[PDB]
Amino acid sequence: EPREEAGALGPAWDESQLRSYSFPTRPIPRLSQSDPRAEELIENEEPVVLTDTNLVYPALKWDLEYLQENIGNGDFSVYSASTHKFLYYDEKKMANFQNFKPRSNREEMKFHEFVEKLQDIQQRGGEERLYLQQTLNDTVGRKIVMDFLGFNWNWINKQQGKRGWGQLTSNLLLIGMEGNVTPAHYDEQQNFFAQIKGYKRCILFPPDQFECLYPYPVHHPCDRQSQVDFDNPDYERFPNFQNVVGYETVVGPGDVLYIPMYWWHHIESLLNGGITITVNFWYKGAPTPKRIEYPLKAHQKVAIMRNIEKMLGEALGNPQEVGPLLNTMIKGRYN
Amino acid sequence: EPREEAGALGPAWDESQLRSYSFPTRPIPRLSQSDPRAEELIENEEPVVLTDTNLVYPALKWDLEYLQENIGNGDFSVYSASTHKFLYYDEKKMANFQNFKPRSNREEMKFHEFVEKLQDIQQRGGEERLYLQQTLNDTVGRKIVMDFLGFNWNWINKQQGKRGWGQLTSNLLLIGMEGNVTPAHYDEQQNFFAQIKGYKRCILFPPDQFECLYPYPVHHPCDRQSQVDFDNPDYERFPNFQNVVGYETVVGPGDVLYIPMYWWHHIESLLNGGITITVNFWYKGAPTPKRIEYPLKAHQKVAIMRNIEKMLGEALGNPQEVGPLLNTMIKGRYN
Ligand SMILES: CCC[C@@H](CC(=O)O)C(=O)C(=O)O
Numbered sequence: 001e002p003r004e005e006a007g008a009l010g011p012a013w014d015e016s017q018l019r020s021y022s023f024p025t026r027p028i029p030r031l032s033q034s035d036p037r038a039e040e041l042i043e044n045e046e047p048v049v050l051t052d053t054n055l056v057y058p059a060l061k062w063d064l065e066y067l068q069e070n071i072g073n074g075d076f077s078v079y080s081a082s083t084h085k086f087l088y089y090d091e092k093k094m095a096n097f098q099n100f101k102p103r104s105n106r107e108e109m110k111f112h113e114f115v116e117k118l119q120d121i122q123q124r125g126g127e128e129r130l131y132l133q134q135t136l137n138d139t140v141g142r143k144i145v146m147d148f149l150g151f152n153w154n155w156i157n158k159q160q161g162k163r164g165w166g167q168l169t170s171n172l173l174l175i176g177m178e179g180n181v182t183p184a185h186y187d188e189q190q191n192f193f194a195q196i197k198g199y200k201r202c203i204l205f206p207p208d209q210f211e212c213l214y215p216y217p218v219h220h221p222c223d224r225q226s227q228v229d230f231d232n233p234d235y236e237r238f239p240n241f242q243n244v245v246g247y248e249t250v251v252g253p254g255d256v257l258y259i260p261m262y263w264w265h266h267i268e269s270l271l272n273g274g275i276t277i278t279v280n281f282w283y284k285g286a287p288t289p290k291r292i293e294y295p296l297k298a299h300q301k302v303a304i305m306r307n308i309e310k311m312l313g314e315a316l317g318n319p320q321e322v323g324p325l326l327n328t329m330i331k332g333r334y335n
Numbered sequence: 336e337p338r339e340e341a342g343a344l345g346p347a348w349d350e351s352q353l354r355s356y357s358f359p360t361r362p363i364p365r366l367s368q369s370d371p372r373a374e375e376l377i378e379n380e381e382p383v384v385l386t387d388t389n390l391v392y393p394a395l396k397w398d399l400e401y402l403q404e405n406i407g408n409g410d411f412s413v414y415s416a417s418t419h420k421f422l423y424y425d426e427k428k429m430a431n432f433q434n435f436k437p438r439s440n441r442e443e444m445k446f447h448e449f450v451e452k453l454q455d456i457q458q459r460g461g462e463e464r465l466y467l468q469q470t471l472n473d474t475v476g477r478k479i480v481m482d483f484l485g486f487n488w489n490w491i492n493k494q495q496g497k498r499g500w501g502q503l504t505s506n507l508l509l510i511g512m513e514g515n516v517t518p519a520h521y522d523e524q525q526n527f528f529a530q531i532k533g534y535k536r537c538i539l540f541p542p543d544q545f546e547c548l549y550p551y552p553v554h555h556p557c558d559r560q561s562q563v564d565f566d567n568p569d570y571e572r573f574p575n576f577q578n579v580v581g582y583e584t585v586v587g588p589g590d591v592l593y594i595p596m597y598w599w600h601h602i603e604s605l606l607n608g609g610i611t612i613t614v615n616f617w618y619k620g621a622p623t624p625k626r627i628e629y630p631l632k633a634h635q636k637v638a639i640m641r642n643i644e645k646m647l648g649e650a651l652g653n654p655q656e657v658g659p660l661l662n663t664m665i666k667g668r669y670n
C-alpha cells in the first residue's frame with residue numbers, strides 16, 4: 001500500500017496512478033540499509049528497496065531548473081514516442097533485422113532544448129512523450145560534479161566489494177514524463193536504481209520466469225526485451241504469460257531499488273505524478289567461479305541459451321538462419 | 336530393375352524379394368571404376384555403385400565353411416533379435432537412458448559357435464535371427480590374412496589420397512540372414528561397402544533430409560539412427576517422413592557402394608536370398624578447411640546441430656536436461 005509523507009502531507013501516491021495489468025504481484029521488501037535481512041537479500045541476488053542509503057542525497061534537490069543551469073552543454077539522448085511505451089532497441093543490431101522500424105525516435109539535443117521541447121508540449125497540450133536517458137560523463141558542470149562526488153560512495157563501494165562485483169560501468173540519468181513506461185526486460189549487469197524525483201512503479205520477475213516472458217532473439221534489436229505487450233497480451237503466441245507473477249514496489253525520492261542482474265523489470269513513471277528523475281548504478285557481475293556448482297541457477301541457464309544463439313549465428317554466418325536450424329534440431333526429437 | 340547373371344543363369348533377384356515401404360526412390364548409378372562420372376560422384380560426395388573395382392576379389396570365394404576353417408579362434412560379436420530389424424545402440428550411452436531396453440541381444444562367441452547356432456535355427460525351423468558384425472583384427476588365420484592382403488589396396492588407397500580422407504578406421508565383417516534389416520542411420524565416416532556373398536538392398540537419403548528422418552538425441556544410445564519405424568511410420572510424430580525420397584540399389588558379389596559420410600542408409604538382406612556377406616571400409620573424412628566457404632553444406636549443419644547437443648549436455652551437467660532447455664529457447668521465440 002502507499003506510504004505516507006512526513007508532516008501529514010498525505011499519501012505521496014494512490015492506487016489510481018498505477019496502470020492495470022493481467023498478472024498478480026507481491027511487494028518487494030522495503031528495508032533499512034542496516035537491516036541484516038537487506039544484506040542477505042542482496043547476497044542472494046533478490047530485489048530489495050533500501051530506504052535510507054543517502055546514496056544520491058545531494059541529487060534530491062535536482063529539478064529541471066537546477067539541472068539546466070549546471071549540467072553543462074553536452075549532448076543528451078532524448079527519445080520521442082507517440083505511445084507511453086519506450087521499447088529499447090540496439091542500433092548496432094538494426095542491420096540484422098532491416099524490417100524492424102522503431103516506435104521511439106532518438107534525438108541528440110542540449111539540455112535547454114530538452115526543457116524547451118517539453119515546455120512546448122505542455123503549452124500546446126500535445127500528447128507526444130519524451131524520455132531523456134543519458135550517461136553522466138565529464139561534460140557536466142562544476143555543481144553537478146560536486147553533487148556526484150557527494151553520493152554515498154562509502155556505502156556502495158562496500159556493496160561492490162562485499163558482492164565481488166566488477167567495476168562501476170556507468171551512471172544513467174533518467175528524466176521521463178508522467179505515465180512513461182520502460183517495457184519489461186532484463187540487464188546483464190547489477191543495478192542499484194536510485195530514485196530522485198517523482199515516483200516509479202517497478203515490477204520485477206525472477207530469471208526463472210524466462211519461459212513466461214518470451215524475450216526477442218539475441219540478434220534482434222530488442223534483445224533482452226519481452227515480446228509480450230503487457231497492455232494486450234497475446235495468449236495464443238505467449239501462453240505462459242498467464243503464469244507470470246511479479247514483485248512490485250513504488251520507489252520515491254531517496255529510495256534505492258536493488259535490481260539483480262538478469263531479473264526482468266518493468267518500470268513506469270506514475271500517472272499524473274509529474275516528471276521523474278532517476279540515476280542508476282550499473283556494475284559488472286562477479287566472475288563465474290572456476291568450479292561450477294550444480295544445480296545451475298536460473299540466470300546461468302539464461303546465459304547458456306544466449307551463448308547458444310550467439311554461437312549459432314556466428315557458425316551459420318547469418319543470424320536469420322538461427323531459428324530454422326533450432327526448429328530442425330527439436331521437431332520430432334526433443335518435443 | 337534386376338541385373339542378369341552371366342551364363343544365362345537368370346535374374347539374380349526379383350522384385351518380390353524387396354520389402355515394401357511408403358516412400359519413392361530413384362536408382363543409384365552403377366558405373367565402372369574407370370568411368371569419369373564415377374570419380375566426379377565420389378568427389379562430390381554422392382553415392383555410386385562401382386561394379387569392377389576387384390576391391391575384395393579374393394573374398395568372393397568366402398562362405399561359412401571356408402571362413403570357419405580359416406578365420407581363426409577369435410571372438411565374434413553376434414546379435415540376436417526376434418524381429419528382422421537390428422537397430423544399433425551404443426552401450427556406452429546406455430547409462431544416460433536407463434529406460435532403454437534393446438531389442439537385439441549381443442553375444443560374444445566363436446565362429447564355429449555362430450555357424451552351429453545358425454544351423455540349429457535352420458534345423459528346427461525357428462524364427463530367431465542372427466547378425467554377425469565383427470571388426471577384422473589380428474586374430475584371423477593365415478589364409479584370411481592372404482585374402483585380406485589381396486584386396487585392391489592400390490585402388491582404394493588412391494581414392495583415400497585423391498579425396499584427402501584420413502586413415503582407414505576399420506573393416507567390418509558382416510554376415511546376416513536373409514531378410515535381416517539394418518534400420519536407417521548415418522555414419523560420421525566415409526564408407527566403401529564391398530558386397531561379397533548374397534544381395535543387399537541399400538536405400539540412401541542425402542544429409543539434407545535430416546528433417547524427414549528424425550534421428551534420436553545425440554546422447555540416446557540410438558544416436559544417429561532414425562526414430563521412424565519404416566514398417567509403420569507414425570506421421571503424427573514424424574510428419575516430414577511423408578516427404579522423404581531415397582536413392583536405391585541392390586548390390587551383389589563384386590559390387591562396391593560408396594556411402595558418403597553423413598548419408599542416411601537403410602540396408603536389408605534380400606528376402607529368401609540366403610546369407611549375405613559384406614566387408615566395409617571406413618575412413619575418417621577430410622579435415623575441415625581453415626576458410627569456411629558459405630553457404631554451408633547440409634552435413635556441416637548436421638555437425639553443428641550435433642555439437643550444440645553435445646555442449647548443452649556438458650554445460651547443463653545432465654543430457655536429460657537438453658530437451659527442456661532447447662524447448663525453452665524456442666517456444667514463442669523462434670517458432
Ligand atoms: C534506460 C534504462 C533505465 C531503467 C528503467 C527506467 O527507469 O525507465 C532500467 O531499465 C534500468 O536502470 O535497468
Ligand SMILES: CCC[C@@H](CC(=O)O)C(=O)C(=O)O
Binds near residue numbers: 468509522526615
Ligand atoms: C554394422 C554396420 C554395417 C552396415 C549395414 C549392413 O550391411 O547391415 C552399415 O550401416 C555400414 O557399413 O555403414
Ligand SMILES: [Zn+2]
Binds near residue numbers: 265
Ligand atoms: Zn533495465
Ligand SMILES: [Zn+2]
Binds near residue numbers: 520521522600
Ligand atoms: Zn552404416
